[PDB]
């Protein structure tokens with residue numbers, strides 16, 4: 001088994017409902033168990049700002065799936081919760097499940113890049129992660145606590 005850390009976002013179609021439904025679906029992933037769920041945070045949108053605020057959260061998922069098999073399931077869950085691809089870059093969505101980390105693994109396949117390429121720059125990923133995994137060390141040895149101590153991130157508010 002490995003512990004994967006999954007970021008959750010939603011800003012459409014009742015985010016609290018979407019995220020609660022997603023937690024139920026994440027539990028139903030085979031070869032996998034949720035270990036820890038963060039608080040839910042209400043975050044202003046980064047990138048395009050002409051969209052509703054996000055509900056962001058993080059989950060620790062123990063799994064024996066292959067990394068791309070986990071991606072298969074997270075993509076399925078997003079699609080089954082009505083995620084629709086629009087042309088605009090970084091538009092709003094009913095559900096977004098980003099695989100932040102997959103153990104200590106560095107993965108670079110056609111479909112999957114882990115660690116998530118920008119997570120170390122995103123408070124809405126790092127703060128819920130720290131809530132559930134304060135002792136976390138990245139594959140490159142960087143400590144989560146040190147990033148959050150040293151770098152300026154805006155304070156997050158709970159949902």
Ligand SMILES: Nc1ncnc2c1ncn2[C@@H]1O[C@H](COP(=O)(O)CP(=O)(O)OP(=O)(O)O)[C@@H](O)[C@H]1O
Pocket residue numbers: 071090096097098099100110111112113114115116117118
């Ligand atoms: N760590 C990861 N977690 C989830 N999907 C990933 C991934 N690494 C690569 N992908 C790929 O990312 C593709 C595009 O996903 P999108 O959800 O449209 C990007 P986004 O989440 O809106 O932006 P972001 O990656 O800047 O957070 C997926 O189809 C998937 O194949």
Ligand SMILES: N#Cc1ccc(CSc2nc3c(=O)[nH]c(N)nc3[nH]2)c(F)c1
Pocket residue numbers: 008009010043044045046047048054056090091096122124
């Ligand atoms: N500068 C910036 C910047 C640009 C694009 C993205 C990726 S699109 C996106 N996803 C979320 C989310 O989950 N939460 C919140 N708050 N804002 C979001 N924006 C980004 F993150 C930051």
Ligand SMILES: [Ca+2]
Pocket residue numbers: 048049050088
């Ligand atoms: Ca827009």
Ligand SMILES: [Ca+2]
Pocket residue numbers: 009096098
């Ligand atoms: Ca994302």
Ligand SMILES: [Ca+2]
Pocket residue numbers: 096097098
């Ligand atoms: Ca995504």
Ligand SMILES: [Ca+2]
Pocket residue numbers: 110
């Ligand atoms: Ca190739």
Ligand SMILES: [Cl-]
Pocket residue numbers: 012082083084085092093094095
């Ligand atoms: Cl959507």
Ligand SMILES: [Cl-]
Pocket residue numbers: 115138139140141
């Ligand atoms: Cl890393």
